[PDB]
Amino acid sequence: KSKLPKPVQDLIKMIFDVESMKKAMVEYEIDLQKMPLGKLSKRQIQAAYSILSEVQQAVSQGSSDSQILDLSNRFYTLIPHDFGMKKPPLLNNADSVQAKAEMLDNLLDIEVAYSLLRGGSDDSSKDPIDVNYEKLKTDIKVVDRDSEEAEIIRKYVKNTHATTHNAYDLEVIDIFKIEREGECQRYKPFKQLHNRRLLWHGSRTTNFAGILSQGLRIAPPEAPVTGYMFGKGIYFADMVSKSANYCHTSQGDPIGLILLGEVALGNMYELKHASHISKLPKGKHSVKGLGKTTPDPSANISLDGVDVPLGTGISSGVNDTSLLYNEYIVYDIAQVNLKYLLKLKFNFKT
């Protein structure tokens, strides 16, 4: 029997659940009879990204539906979908490419989680929770509810839920302080950079074994750059509800996970609309997608020398922008230092 605290044991069970991995793949319309969990590989995912890039080029060249058919079919040959003896839907537009790129990003984290479960040793005398915990190479500790850091974190959740995201309310169940092995050392060239901020990152429950073991990663070179609003980087929000939407929780699964990370933004490149960039302009360290609403800047507080934008939402003064709320993007994995992990209960009003 494990000596780990009960909330840590529940987190490990949740993140390594095989049935949840299968459920995420069904949601993606993947044919599990043709492509089961165990048959998924890095090689196949990479080849699928490369076919999406071929679809992206054909779309930008203004190719007809008859011309795109062979390229669309190629993607389905690599990643089999659930359609029986029917023709699959045509991937003839930008929205299609973006939906499929997002699915492949998720498959990469699911493949990592399954590879950890299969690639080790079997010993019945050890508690499986302890065995799976060690595979994460992350120190996980419970933050005391009555502590100062828990008070600041609860305030950030309470103040940054947008009015436009009123389909649900959030309840903080557990707060974990996290320390990925070697991340602190990796972050050292950016530890004293200006504009360091504590920001949110929401993701499906099935991605968290991949995130804790490998950290937050950028889409690979094979991936189509137009399938990402501001190119291939790591995306964050200053509004808890903007990131919580990306947990993809529902009435049938109302528990989700969210990260709080220290991001070294430095000199920000401020944008109002889509820009599928390969590299940042000289002297820039990040992208700031300018939102119509921003947390109140006079309510900005400091937690261990890092700025926490926990103010209530007010007008930014920015006109004619495609974003309702801010977003922040970094293009170097070393610019992120993961600090906390929150387990949230979603109370749906719909």
Ligand SMILES: Cc1cnc(N2CCN(CCCc3nc4c(Cl)cccc4c(=O)[nH]3)CC2)n1C
């Ligand atoms: C190689 C690799 C491994 N796993 C990945 N994926 C997995 C999927 N994950 C989705 C992130 C979702 C998200 N999007 C946001 C946007 Cl678009 C704006 C503002 C905030 C957010 C936010 O909090 N979460 C991306 C990384 N990749 C690319």
